[PDB]
Design a protein around this ligand. Sequence first.
Ligand SMILES: [Cs+]
Ligand SMILES: [Cs+]
Ligand SMILES: [Cs+]
Ligand SMILES: [Cs+]
Ligand SMILES: [Cs+]
Lengths: 174, 174, 174, 174
Amino acid sequence: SSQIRQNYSTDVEAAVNSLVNLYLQASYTYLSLGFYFDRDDVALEGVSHFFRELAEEKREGYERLLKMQNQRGGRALFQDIKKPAEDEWGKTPDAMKAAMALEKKLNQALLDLHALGSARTDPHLCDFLETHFLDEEVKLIKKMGDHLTNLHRLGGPEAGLGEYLFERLTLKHD
Amino acid sequence: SSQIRQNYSTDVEAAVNSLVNLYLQASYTYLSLGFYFDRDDVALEGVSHFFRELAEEKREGYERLLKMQNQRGGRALFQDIKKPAEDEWGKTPDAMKAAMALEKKLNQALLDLHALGSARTDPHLCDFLETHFLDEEVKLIKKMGDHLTNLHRLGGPEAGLGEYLFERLTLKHD
Amino acid sequence: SSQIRQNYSTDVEAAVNSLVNLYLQASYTYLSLGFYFDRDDVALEGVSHFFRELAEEKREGYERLLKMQNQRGGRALFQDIKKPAEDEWGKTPDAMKAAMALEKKLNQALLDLHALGSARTDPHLCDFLETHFLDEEVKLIKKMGDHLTNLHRLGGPEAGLGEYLFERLTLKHD
Amino acid sequence: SSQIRQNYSTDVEAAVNSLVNLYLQASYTYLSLGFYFDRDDVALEGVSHFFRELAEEKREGYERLLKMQNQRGGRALFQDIKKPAEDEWGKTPDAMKAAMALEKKLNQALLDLHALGSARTDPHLCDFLETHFLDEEVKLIKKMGDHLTNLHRLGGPEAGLGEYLFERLTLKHD
Ligand SMILES: [Cs+]
Ligand SMILES: [Cs+]
Ligand SMILES: [Cs+]
Ligand SMILES: [Cs+]
Ligand SMILES: [Cs+]
């Protein structure tokens, strides 16, 4: 391909373009997640920010991947960006569960890419994923599990009451 | 009449005058709300200060209007200010809804004036309302919507406990 | 409850939703333009940054629209995001031209919305578009026009040397 | 094998001693490249420094390897250093192709070593290369690829004018 391409597999190149579309997509759902909680009849500032922060994280990811793509001599190819799975995310636990579900999916794609790069004998690619993606995913998933356990501990009949306290005392305005 | 009056219909003039009386009535009802929640047998500092800040926000309102009336060459014309609708305002949710009604009524009146202003092709009056009133209302009403929602979430058999947690963790005696 | 909604038309709500989609799309294409110029075979850092900044602009653009939608009582309704109309953008003059048309489509969509809100007699929507959008587009299109004029002024047979000077002296790696 | 040597293959050990000779060799070519452009009849300070900087880097390279060699318990075995391939590198585009070709050779040596260490089940060596070498080469090659492209763009006939503008506006005496 380019004058710089060296030991960069045609498969992995296609594989990353795929991952960037996945992250773009992920980002899109968090954006949705974020404004959902900003609705006057949901009003959970704390959780809203939580998701907006995540949307930016996802953005940083695909931008990170796109930068890498250009460094290895690969050519970025864009695709449509599927709209989020839902339009209304019910209550916080529901939002979290979905968010985690999404992250596990994202983590798997990462493990898959790594496995491929490992196969096509791509040490720079594997190193890249481990440095900027693998540990990030593990930590976010742990964090979400913690949130889940906590939200569950605040379950009904004092459901609403617990959802409020969780946004105030854990998610916090900040 | 006045040496400065130009393109200022006598209708918007009487209308602004009517609007300052409205804002005077609103501010007065917010004063009532504030001291009701300062009562020893209600004692919710956070909501009392919430309403007192609103009495200020309305006072700024009619003052800003009287200031404009003069800038255009109109003449102020004060009328009696009716006492607030209620002497007692029940609980936070009740008080908030009352506030919500009051603000929506106020927003309608702002929108009516803006219509009259466009009918009398008065571009200054219209811009004046958009810069210092319309968005202010949109935002205040949006915030009350959030409080109203968050309060309904705290409702139920432990409503009293929720009312306290809201005054502490959201309105905050700050 | 969307008990806050007042004077917000159902058709404008849909139009704003449609506008955010148009902004999500514009952002997307700028994301594409952005990394294209980062390619080792295009290698024009100056223009790459120029477009990456525009994607951020459009991003803040649609995020601003969503924030408003909720403030009015509207509901965000996301759709698929169509991929950029191109995979490669040729040379600077070509890209700039593409961006310009994108900006005009946008400006047009904004003017159309203002027209609708005006018709639906929604002063807040109108003030909002005039405040955060209309002037920004004009200033941006004028800037683009200026670059076009300058790039053209740097036309062949030494257009290659001209394209390098522009990125160095006008866009600047900053 | 000394008191510290552990899981440190004799193959990889010989590999590194060979690699430092390669970096020592690369270093030497850059000194040659660096001073050629310092000639009164070439006079291109910007490129001269770009190469003296690359020599500095290669020095850090082999030094990092020697420092590593001792940490694993291996012994350094030095050899003669082959003189640079050329004595005059012609023009900026000629040198860059040279350096590019040099870096590619080096990056291949790295990837090879990684494969060997990976094969001899040596995790520390692998990690060491990913952390201090692979990504550096990827960045430098992408870098040189941009320079080449920008050089080719400043093509001809004004190769002379374009070669001066590149050394002034891209490489910079700074
Ligand atoms: Cs590794
Ligand atoms: Cs207006
Ligand atoms: Cs304004
Ligand atoms: Cs690693
Ligand atoms: Cs690492």
